[PDB]
Amino acid sequence: KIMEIKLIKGPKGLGFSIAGGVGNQHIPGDNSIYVTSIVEGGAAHKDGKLQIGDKLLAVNSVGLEEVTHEEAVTALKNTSDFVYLKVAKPT
């Protein structure tokens, strides 16, 4: 249950928080990147697809599977205006 999210960075950013990463497990056993908060009115909220508990697979060209929090944050912030997110939905 992989879905694609194409978004446009608003002024306040992409409008979501992440947790997770190798050395920073969000779920015991899981090194994956996870969305923990969708900020009201932000890019992500207005698009409506992204959801808390979503796992980030890729952002643009940068795969996010088995990486450090800080690598994920860096890649998520190295983004232009146009953002492609590849996500997996829970369970």
Binding site: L14, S17, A19, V39, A72, L76, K77
Partner: peptide, 4 residues
């Protein structure tokens, strides 16, 4: 929990 990074906000971006």
């Amino acid at each position: 929990a990074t906000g971006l």
